[PDB]
mmCIF file of C-alpha atoms in Angstrom:
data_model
loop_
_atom_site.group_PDB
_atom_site.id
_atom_site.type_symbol
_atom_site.label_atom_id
_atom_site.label_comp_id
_atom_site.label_asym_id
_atom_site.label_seq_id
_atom_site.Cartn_x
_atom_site.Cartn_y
_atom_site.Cartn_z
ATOM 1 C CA UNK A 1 -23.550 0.737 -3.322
ATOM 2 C CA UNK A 2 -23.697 1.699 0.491
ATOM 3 C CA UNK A 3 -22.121 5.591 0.874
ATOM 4 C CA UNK A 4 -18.694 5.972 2.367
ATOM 5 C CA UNK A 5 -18.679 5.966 6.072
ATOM 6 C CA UNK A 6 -16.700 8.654 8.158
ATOM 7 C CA UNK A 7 -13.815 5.859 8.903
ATOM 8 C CA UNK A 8 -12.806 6.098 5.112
ATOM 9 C CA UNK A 9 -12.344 9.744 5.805
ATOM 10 C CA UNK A 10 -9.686 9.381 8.827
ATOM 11 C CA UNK A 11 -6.264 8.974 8.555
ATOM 12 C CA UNK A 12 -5.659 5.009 7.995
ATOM 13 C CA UNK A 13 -1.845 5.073 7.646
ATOM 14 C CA UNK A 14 -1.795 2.107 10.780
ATOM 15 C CA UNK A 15 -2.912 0.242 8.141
ATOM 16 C CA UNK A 16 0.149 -0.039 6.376
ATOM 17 C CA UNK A 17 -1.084 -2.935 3.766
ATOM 18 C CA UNK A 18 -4.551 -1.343 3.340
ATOM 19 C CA UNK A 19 -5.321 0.781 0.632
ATOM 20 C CA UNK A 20 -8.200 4.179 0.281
ATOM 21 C CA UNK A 21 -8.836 5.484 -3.383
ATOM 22 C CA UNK A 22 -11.158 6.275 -5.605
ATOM 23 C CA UNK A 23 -12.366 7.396 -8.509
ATOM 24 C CA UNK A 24 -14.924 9.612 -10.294
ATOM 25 C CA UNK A 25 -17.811 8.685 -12.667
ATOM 26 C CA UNK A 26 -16.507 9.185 -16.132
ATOM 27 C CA UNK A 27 -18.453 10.018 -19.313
ATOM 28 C CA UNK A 28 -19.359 6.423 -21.082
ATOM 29 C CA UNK A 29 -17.912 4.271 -17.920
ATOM 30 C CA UNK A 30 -20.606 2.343 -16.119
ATOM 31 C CA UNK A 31 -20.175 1.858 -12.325
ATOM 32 C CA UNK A 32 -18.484 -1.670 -12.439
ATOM 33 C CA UNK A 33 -15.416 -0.062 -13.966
ATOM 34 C CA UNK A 34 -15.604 2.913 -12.213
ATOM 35 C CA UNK A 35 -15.014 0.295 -9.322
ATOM 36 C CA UNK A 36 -11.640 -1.374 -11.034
ATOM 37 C CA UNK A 37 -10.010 1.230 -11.542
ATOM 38 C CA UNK A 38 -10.922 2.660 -7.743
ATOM 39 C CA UNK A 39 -9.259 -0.913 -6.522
ATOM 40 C CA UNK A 40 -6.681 -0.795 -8.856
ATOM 41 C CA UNK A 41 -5.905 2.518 -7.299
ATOM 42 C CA UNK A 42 -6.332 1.571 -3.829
ATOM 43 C CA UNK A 43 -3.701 -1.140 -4.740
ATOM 44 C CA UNK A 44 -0.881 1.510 -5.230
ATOM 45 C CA UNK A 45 -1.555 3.043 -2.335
ATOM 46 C CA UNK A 46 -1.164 -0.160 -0.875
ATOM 47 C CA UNK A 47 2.651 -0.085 -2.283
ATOM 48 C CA UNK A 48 2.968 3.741 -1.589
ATOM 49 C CA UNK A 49 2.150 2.835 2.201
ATOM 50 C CA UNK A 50 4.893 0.341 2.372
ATOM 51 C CA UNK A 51 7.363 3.010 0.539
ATOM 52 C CA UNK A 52 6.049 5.667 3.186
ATOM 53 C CA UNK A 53 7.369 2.773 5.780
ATOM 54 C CA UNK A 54 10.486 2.192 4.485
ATOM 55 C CA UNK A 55 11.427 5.789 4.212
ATOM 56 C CA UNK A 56 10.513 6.488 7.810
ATOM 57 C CA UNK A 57 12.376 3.132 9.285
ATOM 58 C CA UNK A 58 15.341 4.701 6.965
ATOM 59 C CA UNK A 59 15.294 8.051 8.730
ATOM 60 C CA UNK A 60 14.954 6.398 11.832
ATOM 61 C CA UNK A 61 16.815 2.961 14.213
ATOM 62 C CA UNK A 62 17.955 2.312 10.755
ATOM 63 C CA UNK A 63 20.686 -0.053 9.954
ATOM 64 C CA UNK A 64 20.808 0.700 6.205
ATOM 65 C CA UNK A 65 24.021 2.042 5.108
ATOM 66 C CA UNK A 66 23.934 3.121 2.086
ATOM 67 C CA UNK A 67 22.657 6.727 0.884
ATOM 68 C CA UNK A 68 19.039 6.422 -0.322
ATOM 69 C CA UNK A 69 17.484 9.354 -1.797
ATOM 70 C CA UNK A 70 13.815 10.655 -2.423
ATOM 71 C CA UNK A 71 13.533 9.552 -5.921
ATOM 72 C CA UNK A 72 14.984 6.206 -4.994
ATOM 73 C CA UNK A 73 12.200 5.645 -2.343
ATOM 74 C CA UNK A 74 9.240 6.682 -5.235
ATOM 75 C CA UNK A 75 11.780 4.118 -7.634
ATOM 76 C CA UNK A 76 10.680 1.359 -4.946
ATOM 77 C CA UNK A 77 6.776 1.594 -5.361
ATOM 78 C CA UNK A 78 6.968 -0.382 -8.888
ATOM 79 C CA UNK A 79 8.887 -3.034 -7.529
ATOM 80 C CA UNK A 80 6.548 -3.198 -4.364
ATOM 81 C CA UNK A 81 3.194 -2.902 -6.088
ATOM 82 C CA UNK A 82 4.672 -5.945 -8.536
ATOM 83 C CA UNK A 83 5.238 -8.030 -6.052
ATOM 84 C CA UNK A 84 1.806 -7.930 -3.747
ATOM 85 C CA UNK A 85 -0.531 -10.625 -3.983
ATOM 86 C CA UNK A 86 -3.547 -12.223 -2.697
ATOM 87 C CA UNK A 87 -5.043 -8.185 -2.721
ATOM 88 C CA UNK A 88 -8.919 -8.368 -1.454
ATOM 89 C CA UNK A 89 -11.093 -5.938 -1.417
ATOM 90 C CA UNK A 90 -12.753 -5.179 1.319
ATOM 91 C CA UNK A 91 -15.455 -2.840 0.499
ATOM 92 C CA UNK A 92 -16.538 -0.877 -2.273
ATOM 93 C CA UNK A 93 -18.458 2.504 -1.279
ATOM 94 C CA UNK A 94 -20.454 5.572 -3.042
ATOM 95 C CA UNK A 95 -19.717 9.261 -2.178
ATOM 96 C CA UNK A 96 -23.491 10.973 -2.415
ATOM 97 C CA UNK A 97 -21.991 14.009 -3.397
ATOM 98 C CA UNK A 98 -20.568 13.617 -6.524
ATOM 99 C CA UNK A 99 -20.855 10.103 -7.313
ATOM 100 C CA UNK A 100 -17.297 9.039 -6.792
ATOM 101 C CA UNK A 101 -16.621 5.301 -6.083
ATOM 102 C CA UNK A 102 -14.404 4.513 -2.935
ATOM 103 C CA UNK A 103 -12.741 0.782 -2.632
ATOM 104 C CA UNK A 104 -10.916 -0.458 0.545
ATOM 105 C CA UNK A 105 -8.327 -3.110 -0.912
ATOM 106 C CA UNK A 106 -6.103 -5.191 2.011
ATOM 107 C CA UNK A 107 -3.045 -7.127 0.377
ATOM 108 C CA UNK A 108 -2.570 -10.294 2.429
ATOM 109 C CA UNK A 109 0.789 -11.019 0.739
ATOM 110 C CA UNK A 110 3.895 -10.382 -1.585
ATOM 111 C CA UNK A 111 6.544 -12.338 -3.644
ATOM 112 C CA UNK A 112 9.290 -11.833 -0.976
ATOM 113 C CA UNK A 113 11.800 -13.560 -4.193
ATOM 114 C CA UNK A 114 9.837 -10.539 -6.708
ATOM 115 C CA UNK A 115 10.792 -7.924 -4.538
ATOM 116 C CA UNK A 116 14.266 -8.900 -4.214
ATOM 117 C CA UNK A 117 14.928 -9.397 -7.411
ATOM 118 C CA UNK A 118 13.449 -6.074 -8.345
ATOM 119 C CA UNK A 119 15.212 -3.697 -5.537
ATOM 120 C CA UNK A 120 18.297 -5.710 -7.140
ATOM 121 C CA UNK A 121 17.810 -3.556 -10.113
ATOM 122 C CA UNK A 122 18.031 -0.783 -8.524
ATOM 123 C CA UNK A 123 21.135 0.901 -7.555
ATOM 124 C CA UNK A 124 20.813 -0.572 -3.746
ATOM 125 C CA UNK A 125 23.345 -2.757 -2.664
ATOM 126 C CA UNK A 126 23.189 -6.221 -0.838
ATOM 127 C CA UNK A 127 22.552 -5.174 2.550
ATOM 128 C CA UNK A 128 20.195 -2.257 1.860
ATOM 129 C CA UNK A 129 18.337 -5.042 -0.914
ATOM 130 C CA UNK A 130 18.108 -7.563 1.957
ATOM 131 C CA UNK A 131 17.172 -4.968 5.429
ATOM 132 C CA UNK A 132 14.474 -3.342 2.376
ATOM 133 C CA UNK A 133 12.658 -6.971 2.111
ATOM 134 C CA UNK A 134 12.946 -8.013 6.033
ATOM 135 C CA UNK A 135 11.244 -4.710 6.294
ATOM 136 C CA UNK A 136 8.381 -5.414 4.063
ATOM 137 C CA UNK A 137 8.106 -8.953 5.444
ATOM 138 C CA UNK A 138 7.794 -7.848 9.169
ATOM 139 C CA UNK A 139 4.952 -4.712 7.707
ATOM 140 C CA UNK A 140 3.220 -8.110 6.245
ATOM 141 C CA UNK A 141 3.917 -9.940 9.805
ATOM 142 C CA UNK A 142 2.439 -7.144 11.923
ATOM 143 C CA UNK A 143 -0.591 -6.674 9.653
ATOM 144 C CA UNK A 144 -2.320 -9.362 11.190
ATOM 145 C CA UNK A 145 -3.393 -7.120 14.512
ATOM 146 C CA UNK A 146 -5.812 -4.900 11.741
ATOM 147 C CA UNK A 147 -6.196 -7.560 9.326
ATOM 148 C CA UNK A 148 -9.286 -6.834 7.956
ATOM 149 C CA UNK A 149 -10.489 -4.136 10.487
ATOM 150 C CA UNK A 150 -12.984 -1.348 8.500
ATOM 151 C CA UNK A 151 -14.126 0.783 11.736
ATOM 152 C CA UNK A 152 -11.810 1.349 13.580
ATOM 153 C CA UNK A 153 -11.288 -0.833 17.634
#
């Protein structure tokens, strides 16, 4: 495993559907899981990104009606991280220090018909449901000028 560069250290929040996370050596886990659960984690953040997005379009510009609150927006990741697919990761990396594992996870897609039906179960009405999943379709649209970018242009 190569050790993390600086550019996994700078704020990536461009990159709406990348991920960063990690996670620490643990006692009986050999590095190949270590590395799962990193991705798996860098997968959420992935979804947390895209919540992030939302929220700030909201409290824009925003043609949302409806009152949406904090908890709401966190009620949204589930729904979001449900609905990604085709997630690749993009590099796995070793911090020197301690021995933590670092994964870089891109999601090329999501289940626009998941994520509908799941902000449907949520207390969001029509219009919110259906601005809520344009938005996430257009983050997915505009991805494409990072795509797969690691350092930075």
């Amino acid at each position: 495993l190569q050790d993390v560069p600086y550019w996994m250290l700078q704020n990536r929040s461009e990159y709406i559907t990348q991920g960063v996370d990690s996670s620490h050596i643990v006692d009986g886990k050999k590095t190949e899981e270590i590395e799962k659960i990193a991705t798996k984690r860098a997968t959420i953040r992935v979804a947390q990104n895209i919540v992030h997005k939302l929220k700030e379009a909201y409290l824009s510009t925003n043609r949302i009606k409806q009152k949406i609150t904090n908890e709401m927006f966190i009620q949204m990741t589930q729904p979001i991280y449900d609905s990604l697919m085709n997630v690749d990761r993009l590099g796995i990396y070793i911090n020197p220090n301690n021995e933590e594992v670092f994964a870089l996870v891109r999601a090329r897609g999501f289940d626009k018909d998941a994520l509908s039906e799941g902000l449907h179960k949520m207390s969001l009405d029509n219009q919110a449901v259906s601005i809520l999943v344009a938005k996430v379709e257009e983050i997915f649209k505009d991805s494409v000028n990072y795509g797969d970018v690691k350092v930075p242009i």
